[PDB]
Design an enzyme around this catalytic site. Sequence first.
Site, PDB file in Angstrom:
ATOM      1  N   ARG B 255      11.114   7.641  13.289  1.00  0.00           N
ATOM      2  CA  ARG B 255      10.371   7.471  12.138  1.00  0.00           C
ATOM      3  C   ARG B 255      10.563   8.658  11.237  1.00  0.00           C
ATOM      4  O   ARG B 255      10.819   8.563  10.041  1.00  0.00           O
ATOM      5  CB  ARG B 255       8.907   7.585  12.652  1.00  0.00           C
ATOM      6  CG  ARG B 255       7.776   7.815  11.458  1.00  0.00           C
ATOM      7  CD  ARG B 255       6.279   7.747  11.784  1.00  0.00           C
ATOM      8  NE  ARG B 255       5.641   8.237  10.781  1.00  0.00           N
ATOM      9  CZ  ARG B 255       4.983   7.225   9.760  1.00  0.00           C
ATOM     10  NH1 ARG B 255       5.084   6.303  10.038  1.00  0.00           N
ATOM     11  NH2 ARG B 255       4.005   7.899   8.931  1.00  0.00           N
ATOM     12  N   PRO B 328      -5.720  16.351  10.370  1.00  0.00           N
ATOM     13  CA  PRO B 328      -6.792  16.289   9.163  1.00  0.00           C
ATOM     14  C   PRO B 328      -6.958  15.304   8.520  1.00  0.00           C
ATOM     15  O   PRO B 328      -6.089  14.408   8.176  1.00  0.00           O
ATOM     16  CB  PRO B 328      -5.564  17.466   8.544  1.00  0.00           C
ATOM     17  CG  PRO B 328      -4.707  17.769   9.634  1.00  0.00           C
ATOM     18  CD  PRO B 328      -4.546  16.452  10.626  1.00  0.00           C
ATOM     19  N   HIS B 356      -2.679  18.950   0.601  1.00  0.00           N
ATOM     20  CA  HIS B 356      -2.233  17.345   0.590  1.00  0.00           C
ATOM     21  C   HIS B 356      -3.723  16.746   0.597  1.00  0.00           C
ATOM     22  O   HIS B 356      -3.912  15.737  -0.080  1.00  0.00           O
ATOM     23  CB  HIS B 356      -1.146  17.172   1.685  1.00  0.00           C
ATOM     24  CG  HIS B 356      -1.182  15.599   1.736  1.00  0.00           C
ATOM     25  ND1 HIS B 356      -2.095  14.645   2.389  1.00  0.00           N
ATOM     26  CD2 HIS B 356      -0.064  15.037   1.770  1.00  0.00           C
ATOM     27  CE1 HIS B 356      -1.545  13.567   2.408  1.00  0.00           C
ATOM     28  NE2 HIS B 356      -0.172  13.467   2.088  1.00  0.00           N
ATOM     29  N   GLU B 357      -4.591  17.328   1.602  1.00  0.00           N
ATOM     30  CA  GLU B 357      -5.819  16.804   1.746  1.00  0.00           C
ATOM     31  C   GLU B 357      -6.825  17.014   0.609  1.00  0.00           C
ATOM     32  O   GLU B 357      -7.646  16.221   0.278  1.00  0.00           O
ATOM     33  CB  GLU B 357      -6.453  17.056   3.166  1.00  0.00           C
ATOM     34  CG  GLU B 357      -5.790  16.990   4.208  1.00  0.00           C
ATOM     35  CD  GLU B 357      -5.782  15.319   4.731  1.00  0.00           C
ATOM     36  OE1 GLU B 357      -6.527  14.523   4.100  1.00  0.00           O
ATOM     37  OE2 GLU B 357      -4.718  14.993   5.515  1.00  0.00           O
ATOM     38  N   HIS B 360      -6.286  14.575  -2.019  1.00  0.00           N
ATOM     39  CA  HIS B 360      -6.682  13.198  -1.386  1.00  0.00           C
ATOM     40  C   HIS B 360      -8.119  13.540  -1.977  1.00  0.00           C
ATOM     41  O   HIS B 360      -8.855  12.368  -2.497  1.00  0.00           O
ATOM     42  CB  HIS B 360      -6.798  13.175   0.181  1.00  0.00           C
ATOM     43  CG  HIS B 360      -5.514  12.473   0.658  1.00  0.00           C
ATOM     44  ND1 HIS B 360      -4.952  11.191   0.102  1.00  0.00           N
ATOM     45  CD2 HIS B 360      -4.972  12.570   1.645  1.00  0.00           C
ATOM     46  CE1 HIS B 360      -4.104  10.836   0.783  1.00  0.00           C
ATOM     47  NE2 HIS B 360      -3.911  11.726   1.809  1.00  0.00           N
ATOM     48  N   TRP B 459      16.798  -7.837  15.833  1.00  0.00           N
ATOM     49  CA  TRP B 459      16.008  -6.582  15.457  1.00  0.00           C
ATOM     50  C   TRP B 459      17.150  -5.260  15.735  1.00  0.00           C
ATOM     51  O   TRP B 459      17.251  -4.520  14.933  1.00  0.00           O
ATOM     52  CB  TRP B 459      15.032  -6.361  16.463  1.00  0.00           C
ATOM     53  CG  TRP B 459      13.997  -5.140  16.052  1.00  0.00           C
ATOM     54  CD1 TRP B 459      13.323  -5.149  15.023  1.00  0.00           C
ATOM     55  CD2 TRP B 459      13.956  -3.702  16.804  1.00  0.00           C
ATOM     56  NE1 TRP B 459      12.584  -3.869  14.796  1.00  0.00           N
ATOM     57  CE2 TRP B 459      13.007  -2.938  15.790  1.00  0.00           C
ATOM     58  CE3 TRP B 459      14.288  -3.186  17.750  1.00  0.00           C
ATOM     59  CZ2 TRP B 459      12.629  -1.782  16.229  1.00  0.00           C
ATOM     60  CZ3 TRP B 459      14.088  -2.113  18.415  1.00  0.00           C
ATOM     61  CH2 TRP B 459      13.155  -1.301  17.392  1.00  0.00           C
ATOM     62  N   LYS B 463      18.734  -3.011  13.113  1.00  0.00           N
ATOM     63  CA  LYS B 463      18.767  -1.619  12.993  1.00  0.00           C
ATOM     64  C   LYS B 463      20.238  -1.221  12.831  1.00  0.00           C
ATOM     65  O   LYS B 463      20.520  -0.086  12.355  1.00  0.00           O
ATOM     66  CB  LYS B 463      18.250  -1.180  14.345  1.00  0.00           C
ATOM     67  CG  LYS B 463      18.039   0.160  14.614  1.00  0.00           C
ATOM     68  CD  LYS B 463      17.456   0.730  15.717  1.00  0.00           C
ATOM     69  CE  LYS B 463      15.844   0.318  15.882  1.00  0.00           C
ATOM     70  NZ  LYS B 463      15.192   1.328  14.999  1.00  0.00           N
ATOM     71  N   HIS B 487       1.356   2.388  14.297  1.00  0.00           N
ATOM     72  CA  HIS B 487       1.016   1.697  12.962  1.00  0.00           C
ATOM     73  C   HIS B 487       1.004   0.189  13.247  1.00  0.00           C
ATOM     74  O   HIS B 487       0.350  -0.586  12.981  1.00  0.00           O
ATOM     75  CB  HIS B 487       1.722   1.998  11.836  1.00  0.00           C
ATOM     76  CG  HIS B 487       1.709   3.308  11.437  1.00  0.00           C
ATOM     77  ND1 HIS B 487       2.602   4.446  11.943  1.00  0.00           N
ATOM     78  CD2 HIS B 487       0.895   3.970  10.616  1.00  0.00           C
ATOM     79  CE1 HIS B 487       2.174   5.632  11.640  1.00  0.00           C
ATOM     80  NE2 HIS B 487       1.125   5.205  10.615  1.00  0.00           N
TER      81      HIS B 487
END
Lengths: 201, 596
Positions: B255, B328, B356-357, B360, B459, B463, B487
């Site tokens: 990721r 967080p 960052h928060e 938000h 897949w 990739k 996710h």
Amino acid sequence: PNITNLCPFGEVFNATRFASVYAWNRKRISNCVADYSVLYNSASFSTFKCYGVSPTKLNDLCFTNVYADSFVIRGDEVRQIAPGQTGKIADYNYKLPDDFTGCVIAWNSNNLDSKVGGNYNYRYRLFRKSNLKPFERDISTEIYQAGSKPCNGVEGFNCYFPLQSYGFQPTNGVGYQPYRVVVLSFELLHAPATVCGPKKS
Amino acid sequence: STIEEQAKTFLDKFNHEAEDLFYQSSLASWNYNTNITEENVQNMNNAGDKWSAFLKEQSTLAQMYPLQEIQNLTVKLQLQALQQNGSSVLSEDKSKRLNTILNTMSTIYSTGKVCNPDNPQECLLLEPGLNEIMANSLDYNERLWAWESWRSEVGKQLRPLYEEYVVLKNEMARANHYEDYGDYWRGDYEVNGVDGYDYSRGQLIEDVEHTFEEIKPLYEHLHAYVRAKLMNAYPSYISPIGCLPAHLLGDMWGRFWTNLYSLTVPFGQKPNIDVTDAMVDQAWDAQRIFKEAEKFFVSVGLPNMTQGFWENSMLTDPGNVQKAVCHPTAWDLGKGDFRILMCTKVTMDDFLTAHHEMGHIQYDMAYAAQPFLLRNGANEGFHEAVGEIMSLSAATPKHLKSIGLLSPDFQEDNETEINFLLKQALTIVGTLPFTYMLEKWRWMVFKGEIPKDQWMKKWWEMKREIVGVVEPVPHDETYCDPASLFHVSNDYSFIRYYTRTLYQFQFQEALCQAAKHEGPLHKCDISNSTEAGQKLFNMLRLGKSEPWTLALENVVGAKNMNVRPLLNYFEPLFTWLKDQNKNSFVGWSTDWSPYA
Ligand SMILES: *[C@@H]1O[C@H](CO)[C@@H](O)[C@H](O)[C@H]1NC(C)=O
Ligand SMILES: *[C@@H]1O[C@H](CO)[C@@H](O)[C@H](O)[C@H]1NC(C)=O
Ligand SMILES: *[C@@H]1O[C@H](CO)[C@@H](O)[C@H](O)[C@H]1NC(C)=O
Ligand SMILES: *[C@@H]1O[C@H](CO)[C@@H](O)[C@H](O)[C@H]1NC(C)=O
Ligand SMILES: *[C@@H]1O[C@H](CO)[C@@H](O)[C@H](O)[C@H]1NC(C)=O
Ligand SMILES: *[C@@H]1O[C@H](CO)[C@@H](O)[C@H](O)[C@H]1NC(C)=O
Ligand SMILES: *[C@@H]1O[C@H](CO)[C@@H](O)[C@H](O)[C@H]1NC(C)=O
């Protein structure tokens, strides 16, 4: 002359409980001496907006009667307590005239009127067929008809109960916290004016 | 009288009785998160059940107002949001089966423990047992063992479950007037009824391919450089002509590439911009970190935090006796209550996370004037993008010098900019092909383009074709390699990261142009600029009332997502990588040349 019998402002500002905005309390104040400088010099009030008169000359002028209207609204709805405004409170709960002489005093009451579970004792009229006249009180609890269909007494679909409760938590923001509003209305009528200010020596 | 007035009164009745219920649910969720106790779990579940039941009853009442007789855009948007069936259209047996499948996948992912065969007396969980091994080990067979064992156990458990999941979600989506579940996810970006600003569900895939085709040269050069450095680190495994081995990317799934910064640093001799020691020397508390973030937001012109924020937020770990989630999170509890739950340490990462928060929180505060059902971002991308722009601006050396955390005589030469841009590319550019390939694979699975017996053969082929990452050993159809990620296993959309990444740099170019920055884009700081804050706040105040296309017009002046600001951001790095790749071969071969 020595002056006594001061006006009962303790029973309006320092009341243990305030009324809901739909059923706002009106107290007629007459035949006493009104000391307005105690209110003006207080730092406890967030809004002290006077319309049609200035606070400095209040302590000199004399009026026939004083109307003290007391209620509780949200923080964001204090702006609607003014002449010419539009909103839920102005149209459906408490309407002020354009030709209004008096003062609107509002202060934060998060300490008293908010509980951890939620204080739902304060209600507001959310829907009415027509706008309120100035200084009108509506305590009716009849189901609002939003659709042609006959409501027939029951709260179902398109038919809503007009009085909706308010939710007061101590952790809410300043625009959702309860604010106690006292509106003083000063009128001069043909009768001899009896609410006079204190005479300085 | 008319349908539109009836809908407006119904929406008022909804917003009023839904804000308090949402506040109760959110407050119960907060009490669970700051205090993990079984009674708090029960209170959270009760509040969630009440909230869900109320939403079901209001949706059932809401469907009775036909959409085509309402012309006001805001009323139509709220009615469209309320009238969605969701899982309600499916039968009760299948809905219960779907909920059971989702819960069991959540438990399998969360409580999945894997350790080495022949030594089973104790085992390591994914966080933090396997994360540290994947991020810090330099051993080929150890990383290969961890990767293969975790995909073996998790995939073999999750493959029948995912096979049931795709069928049930497709059934729900076709029952909800969608082509597939992929169309349902793509419907978040759907704009209908606005002249010129209309966006179709089918246009999203085309725009993503069109942007990725421009992403591909930069990613190819970055991939070649990473391949050369990993070849230096591991001498014989990596081929000059082939793809990268899957277990060597620094994370469990690939990721992010941010764990390869130590191996792939351009100029190790030069110093870093780490400011942790400076805060430790000056005794910077977490309260000071949030106050500095507040100072940054008042510098750009945005409103400062409420008293309730400072009183009610948990900005430090509570202690041993009281358990809390460490992640967080910014909470918009409702009724003007905004809080941040972060276990803040004295690190640069926590400071950037605080920015960052708080970004938000600023985004949540801005649309508080809007009706309750429109209190969200215009799309899923904007909400994360507005925090990422603050993370970008706060990390700049000019901001660190301005707030005193960096020495005023710090030398900013080109080499530090190159290594900083490479770190930002490994975090930001590296996630884009993985995100695009994963979402395209899931969309093809939902659409039925890929049959169940051909999921993995396609897949890995995807990739190799897109990500340039090869499998260490071949996998058959008993494996479920995608669902090892958080996710996908927990029913979350994944294209938000791709859209967030493009929107981040589009917003950054727009605000830097507003702030009259005259240098490189990565050296731009949006502090002290009232006009940049006003341009941002114009979009921030709208919330979900207006289409995301119109919001993007408000900020950057374009009616569509664009890829050019990202390429402009990494242009120094692009020139440096093109210079450094003269001897090496850009691009990869899809064959099994390194290892299979
Ligand atoms: C009302 O309460 C305030 C605060 O307790 C007090 O100071 C004040 O004297 C009271 N009376 C009036 C008339 O304001
Ligand atoms: C957390 O829960 C425990 C359980 O008894 C309670 O004693 C404590 O006061 C709670 N703390 C907070 C901050 O809610
Ligand atoms: C839509 O409704 C809102 C309130 O419900 C109103 O303020 C707004 O002006 C309306 N928009 C149009 C275009 O009529
Ligand atoms: C939701 O489901 C009900 C019953 O299945 C259906 O009548 C209604 O049209 C659905 N909603 C939409 C927006 O299609
Ligand atoms: C937030 O800003 C207002 C006005 O800019 C200021 O009066 C207030 O003190 C500030 N809040 C804090 C906690 O500093
Ligand atoms: C950095 O600038 C110096 C001075 O012009 C130059 O010699 C050097 O090649 C540059 N290096 C990079 C990586 O841009
Ligand atoms: C932004 O404003 C503050 C307040 O005066 C100042 O200290 C800071 O240096 C300014 N930023 C820049 C880059 O000048």
